[PDB]
Design a protein around this ligand. Structure first.
Ligand SMILES: O=C(CCCC[C@@H]1SC[C@@H]2NC(=O)N[C@@H]21)NCCN1C(=O)c2cccc3c(N4CCc5ccccc5C4)ccc(c23)C1=O
Ligand SMILES: O=C(CCCC[C@@H]1SC[C@@H]2NC(=O)N[C@@H]21)NCCN1C(=O)c2cccc3c(N4CCc5ccccc5C4)ccc(c23)C1=O
Lengths: 124, 124, 124, 124
């Protein structure tokens, strides 16, 4: 269990802030603040992690979602990050993400961005 | 709000079963059973949706995660689906997904599968 | 060798037209016309396929790129499709694609769309 | 035209080597050697780039494919990279990639890896 390793405040390469609690049962709960895009302040996130990872030096699989609606803005979109937690002196969460916007059926082909974020426990 | 539209039992093209409740506040909670892969029975899922979508015929953005650990198996992996709900006679959730396995740093380049699932309210 | 199987005119679910020749050496050459987006008429494509696939009923891996510049328009973007050819009565090329736009460094996080196209030998 | 900027030898974070020539007409031709996976020596690549990019500080969109068959091995797979070239003192090609394996129809859901490579003109 990397419950203690995951729980806390993380920062990515864009200067976004991910604040998460890992539950003993595999839950992830917290808030996300994006440094970029159609976003202001904090947004709810929820997700899941592997609470019993392999003991062979592998990372810990996890993922989470943010819907980009809060009390300030609604960007009619949702991002999911999928990745793994790697513990140790320079702990990191290495992710790839999919960001889908609500679209008409005609525009569905251009609904989804893909990218990658790396989170660390220390900021830019 | 497509709270009522989203809530329920959905099936994809592989014969997997997604059982979800949509909360008024943007939460998604439920269980997932995969017809394929290193999986048996139900797994917890959690996610988020846009509870106030655009009124212009656009779909409703949403996403969710499953960590592939339950009481029967642990596949040391997590999938996130990102997509949109489209209401109407033939309601569907159109998704793309990222499935990350825990890996060593040496194998991280081959950690993540990508695919697409389409869910409907009626099964194969 | 599915050189003969691949060579020809293919259509996707959007009504786009892919015209390709497969070389004995693994080359793919041809033109692409998109039914959607910032595109008009034909664009050059090039790519590669596995000219000696497994004999066990597996599909044939292949990919190709289009840069969205021709004599009519320049959309400062490029798409790559990655996928497999499946032969037989209802032959199909099943792909996932990445479409990158040129961006400033500040906007690089939103540079790349992801999607999926299925090509068949008969049109909508 | 970043024909001169693109042409040359590039290295990614895995220690792979990409050797490319950019044509005046938008072509990319060359060889790829992977430091990882089911690969040995050089493989043919082909692709396309935007030969007339925006003059506003944007990167130059490009993509290319490798089919993982040469005279030494056949991995029954193909990778496509989609990304942009960014010129200047520390020139880089920032990419995301899709790697599809030939599979049976039953295994198609697990056919495609996704990742990201950053290429520079100087090696690890
Ligand atoms: O901004 C937000 C909320 C904050 C998101 C922050 C992200 S989460 C991942 C990353 N990590 C991080 O910490 N922070 C960032 N939500 C909307 C985000 N958004 C999309 O959803 C979207 C979805 C689909 C297409 C496009 C899009 N194009 C592609 C090119 C193109 C070409 C011709 C015509 C049309 C288009 C459309 C452009 C921008 C967008 C977009 C775009 O901003
Ligand atoms: O190795 C090569 C040639 C060299 C590729 C080098 C890459 S190009 C991108 C990157 N940049 C670079 O410079 N060098 C690397 N070709 C085959 C590569 N390859 C796939 O195509 C593949 C395709 C689909 C699934 C899987 C795969 N899983 C995912 C997890 C899973 C779980 C349960 C059961 C099954 C599976 C299957 C594992 C490995 C592979 C794989 C795998 O090695």
């Amino acid at each position: 269990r990397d419950q203690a390793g995951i729980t806390g405040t993380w920062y990515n390469q864009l200067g976004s802030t991910f604040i998460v609690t890992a539950g003993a049962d595999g839950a992830l709960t917290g808030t996300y603040e994006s440094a970029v895009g159609n976003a202001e302040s904090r947004y709810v996130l929820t997700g899941r992690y592997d609470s019993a990872p392999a003991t062979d030096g592998s990372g810990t699989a996890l993922g989470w979602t943010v819907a980009w609606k809060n009390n300030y803005r609604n960007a009619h979109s949702a991002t999911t990050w999928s990745g793994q937690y790697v513990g140790g002196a320079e702990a990191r969460i290495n992710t790839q993400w999919l960001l889908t916007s609500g679209t008409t059926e005609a525009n569905a082909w251009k609904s989804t961005l893909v990218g990658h974020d790396t989170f660390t426990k220390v900021k830019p």
